[PDB]
Amino acid sequence: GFKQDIATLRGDLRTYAQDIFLAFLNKYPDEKRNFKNYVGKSDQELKSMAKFGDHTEKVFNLMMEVADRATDCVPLASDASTLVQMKQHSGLTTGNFEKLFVALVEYMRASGQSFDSQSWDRFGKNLVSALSSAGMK
Ligand code: HEM
Ligand SMILES: Oc1c(F)cccc1F
């Protein structure tokens, strides 16, 4: 289930962090509007670019801590506040987060693996609600 999935993802974190973010950017090409540096690059090129590797691993590190601190796929209000109050997310709306989690869930569905995709889908919808509650537009 959800907790084991966090351990699975952490066990190959750099490869999952990259592959899931790339699934997000390729499913939602207009999301590159927040990532000008990424435009006109193939996956393999992105995975050579220093800000890409470092950003993707920092997102997935923090994602997994918020998932690990959740109860029944419901994130802490404190983690939602932190995410809202981040200077880097100045531009962002919950729709950015909804899309990341749709891609994650669809990546998990297509994997050969026994990920609890139901629980990640629930986690993403609960995170979006929390973010709204904490001030994100
Ligand atoms: C659970 C979900 C997410 C977590 C935990 C998270 C976490 C983080 C963290 C820790 C940073 C700081 C990275 C750094 O600059 O060192 C960051 C930066 C950033 N995040 Fe997020 N993030 C999430 C979702 C999103 C989404 C969905 C977007 C855009 C669609 C986004 C866009 C950014 C951008 C643009 C930056 C800084 C500029 C750059 O990418 O280089 N984040 N995020
Ligand atoms: O505690 C944190 C951070 F330090 C960064 C992003 C999200 C989060 F919940």
Short mmCIF file of C-alpha atoms and ligand atoms in Angstrom, two decimals:
data_model
loop_
_atom_site.label_atom_id
_atom_site.label_comp_id
_atom_site.label_asym_id
_atom_site.label_seq_id
_atom_site.Cartn_x
_atom_site.Cartn_y
_atom_site.Cartn_z
CA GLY A 1 0.00 0.00 0.00
CA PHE A 2 0.76 3.70 0.30
CA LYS A 3 3.49 3.40 2.98
CA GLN A 4 5.32 0.58 1.14
CA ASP A 5 5.07 2.67 -2.08
CA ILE A 6 6.96 5.52 -0.34
CA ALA A 7 9.77 2.97 0.53
CA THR A 8 9.76 1.61 -3.08
CA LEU A 9 10.03 5.15 -4.57
CA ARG A 10 12.77 6.20 -2.08
CA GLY A 11 14.75 3.01 -2.96
CA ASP A 12 15.36 4.42 -6.52
CA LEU A 13 14.54 8.01 -5.84
CA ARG A 14 16.58 9.77 -8.59
CA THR A 15 15.11 7.47 -11.36
CA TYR A 16 11.48 7.75 -10.11
CA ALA A 17 11.78 11.52 -9.44
CA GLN A 18 13.03 12.06 -13.02
CA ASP A 19 10.64 9.59 -14.74
CA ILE A 20 7.52 10.91 -12.94
CA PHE A 21 8.34 14.60 -13.53
CA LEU A 22 9.00 13.79 -17.24
CA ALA A 23 5.63 11.96 -17.38
CA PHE A 24 4.07 15.16 -15.99
CA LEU A 25 5.84 17.49 -18.52
CA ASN A 26 5.02 15.20 -21.52
CA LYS A 27 1.34 14.70 -20.50
CA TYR A 28 0.92 18.48 -19.86
CA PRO A 29 3.26 20.27 -22.32
CA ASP A 30 1.73 23.72 -21.43
CA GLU A 31 3.25 23.17 -17.86
CA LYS A 32 6.69 23.98 -19.41
CA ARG A 33 5.29 27.58 -19.25
CA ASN A 34 6.60 27.48 -15.57
CA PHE A 35 9.93 25.92 -16.77
CA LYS A 36 11.29 28.05 -19.68
CA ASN A 37 14.76 26.30 -19.42
CA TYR A 38 13.10 22.93 -20.31
CA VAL A 39 11.54 23.90 -23.72
CA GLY A 40 12.96 22.22 -26.87
CA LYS A 41 14.71 19.46 -24.85
CA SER A 42 14.18 15.66 -25.15
CA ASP A 43 13.87 13.63 -21.90
CA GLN A 44 17.56 12.52 -22.09
CA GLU A 45 18.67 16.16 -22.49
CA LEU A 46 16.51 17.32 -19.52
CA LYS A 47 18.13 14.51 -17.42
CA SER A 48 21.57 16.03 -18.24
CA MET A 49 20.51 19.61 -17.07
CA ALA A 50 21.71 20.48 -13.50
CA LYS A 51 18.59 22.51 -12.40
CA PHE A 52 16.37 19.62 -13.73
CA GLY A 53 18.10 16.81 -11.69
CA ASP A 54 18.35 18.97 -8.56
CA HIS A 55 14.79 20.42 -8.73
CA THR A 56 13.18 17.03 -9.59
CA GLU A 57 15.01 15.25 -6.70
CA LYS A 58 14.12 18.12 -4.23
CA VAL A 59 10.42 17.98 -5.25
CA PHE A 60 10.32 14.14 -4.87
CA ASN A 61 12.31 14.25 -1.55
CA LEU A 62 9.81 16.73 -0.04
CA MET A 63 6.67 14.90 -1.84
CA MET A 64 7.76 11.69 -0.03
CA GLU A 65 8.15 13.44 3.38
CA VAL A 66 4.62 14.96 2.98
CA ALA A 67 3.31 11.49 1.98
CA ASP A 68 5.16 9.90 4.98
CA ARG A 69 3.70 12.43 7.48
CA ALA A 70 0.13 11.92 6.08
CA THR A 71 -2.60 9.88 7.90
CA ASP A 72 -4.79 7.77 5.56
CA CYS A 73 -3.46 9.80 2.56
CA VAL A 74 -4.39 13.14 4.31
CA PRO A 75 -1.44 15.55 4.49
CA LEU A 76 -0.58 17.70 7.54
CA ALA A 77 -2.03 21.25 7.39
CA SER A 78 1.62 22.36 8.28
CA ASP A 79 3.00 20.72 5.09
CA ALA A 80 0.23 22.37 3.03
CA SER A 81 1.06 25.80 4.58
CA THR A 82 4.84 25.30 3.84
CA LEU A 83 4.02 24.41 0.23
CA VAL A 84 1.79 27.52 -0.13
CA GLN A 85 4.26 29.92 1.59
CA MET A 86 7.19 28.86 -0.74
CA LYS A 87 8.58 31.92 -2.71
CA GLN A 88 9.33 29.52 -5.70
CA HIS A 89 5.57 28.62 -5.96
CA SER A 90 4.61 32.37 -6.26
CA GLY A 91 2.99 31.70 -9.71
CA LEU A 92 1.41 28.25 -9.00
CA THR A 93 -2.26 27.20 -8.56
CA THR A 94 -3.68 23.90 -7.21
CA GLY A 95 -4.18 22.94 -10.93
CA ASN A 96 -0.39 22.62 -11.24
CA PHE A 97 -0.48 20.11 -8.31
CA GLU A 98 -3.57 18.25 -9.63
CA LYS A 99 -1.71 17.64 -12.94
CA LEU A 100 1.46 16.40 -11.22
CA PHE A 101 -0.62 13.82 -9.29
CA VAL A 102 -2.70 12.71 -12.35
CA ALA A 103 0.63 12.00 -14.13
CA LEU A 104 1.99 10.20 -11.03
CA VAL A 105 -1.12 7.98 -10.80
CA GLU A 106 -1.01 7.23 -14.57
CA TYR A 107 2.74 6.43 -14.32
CA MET A 108 1.97 4.01 -11.46
CA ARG A 109 -0.97 2.36 -13.36
CA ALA A 110 1.36 1.66 -16.38
CA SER A 111 4.30 0.39 -14.30
CA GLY A 112 4.70 -3.33 -13.98
CA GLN A 113 4.50 -2.85 -10.16
CA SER A 114 1.91 -3.30 -7.33
CA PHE A 115 1.75 0.44 -6.45
CA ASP A 116 -1.44 1.40 -4.58
CA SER A 117 -2.45 3.89 -7.38
CA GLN A 118 -5.92 4.39 -5.63
CA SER A 119 -4.15 5.75 -2.52
CA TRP A 120 -1.87 8.13 -4.50
CA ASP A 121 -4.98 9.44 -6.38
CA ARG A 122 -6.67 10.07 -2.94
CA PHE A 123 -3.41 11.66 -1.61
CA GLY A 124 -3.26 14.05 -4.60
CA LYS A 125 -6.93 15.14 -4.22
CA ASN A 126 -6.45 15.61 -0.41
CA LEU A 127 -3.21 17.60 -0.98
CA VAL A 128 -5.04 19.89 -3.48
CA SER A 129 -7.86 20.47 -0.92
CA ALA A 130 -5.26 21.20 1.83
CA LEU A 131 -3.33 23.61 -0.42
CA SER A 132 -6.56 25.52 -1.18
CA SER A 133 -7.40 25.59 2.59
CA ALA A 134 -3.86 26.92 3.28
CA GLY A 135 -4.16 29.85 0.73
CA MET A 136 -3.13 28.61 -2.75
CA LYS A 137 -5.41 29.98 -5.56
C1 HEM B 1 4.12 17.65 -3.63
C2 HEM B 1 4.39 18.46 -4.67
C3 HEM B 1 5.58 19.39 -4.74
C4 HEM B 1 6.66 19.53 -3.87
C5 HEM B 1 6.96 18.72 -2.65
C6 HEM B 1 7.48 20.61 -4.32
C7 HEM B 1 8.69 20.98 -3.68
C8 HEM B 1 9.58 21.94 -4.17
C9 HEM B 1 10.83 22.27 -3.61
C10 HEM B 1 11.42 21.66 -2.36
C11 HEM B 1 11.38 23.25 -4.36
C12 HEM B 1 12.70 23.91 -4.13
C13 HEM B 1 13.65 23.33 -5.18
C14 HEM B 1 14.85 24.24 -5.32
O1 HEM B 1 14.75 25.32 -6.00
O2 HEM B 1 15.90 23.86 -4.72
C15 HEM B 1 10.50 23.54 -5.41
C16 HEM B 1 10.76 24.48 -6.40
C17 HEM B 1 9.91 24.64 -7.42
N1 HEM B 1 8.75 23.99 -7.60
FE1 HEM B 1 7.85 22.77 -6.48
N2 HEM B 1 6.97 21.14 -5.44
C18 HEM B 1 5.82 20.48 -5.75
C19 HEM B 1 4.94 20.73 -6.84
C20 HEM B 1 5.24 21.65 -7.85
C21 HEM B 1 4.55 21.76 -9.08
C22 HEM B 1 3.35 20.93 -9.47
C23 HEM B 1 5.19 22.76 -9.84
C24 HEM B 1 4.89 23.24 -11.21
C25 HEM B 1 3.98 22.66 -11.99
C26 HEM B 1 6.27 23.23 -9.06
C27 HEM B 1 7.13 24.19 -9.49
C28 HEM B 1 8.28 24.51 -8.78
C29 HEM B 1 9.19 25.46 -9.40
C30 HEM B 1 8.99 26.19 -10.72
C31 HEM B 1 10.21 25.56 -8.55
C32 HEM B 1 11.43 26.45 -8.72
C33 HEM B 1 11.90 26.75 -10.14
C34 HEM B 1 12.54 25.51 -10.72
O3 HEM B 1 11.83 24.54 -11.04
O4 HEM B 1 13.79 25.45 -10.89
N3 HEM B 1 6.30 22.54 -7.86
N4 HEM B 1 9.41 22.71 -5.27
O1 LIG B 2 8.47 20.90 4.87
C1 LIG B 2 8.45 21.18 3.55
C2 LIG B 2 9.52 21.80 2.92
F1 LIG B 2 10.62 22.10 3.64
C3 LIG B 2 9.49 22.08 1.58
C4 LIG B 2 8.36 21.77 0.85
C5 LIG B 2 7.28 21.16 1.45
C6 LIG B 2 7.34 20.87 2.79
F2 LIG B 2 6.28 20.31 3.40
#
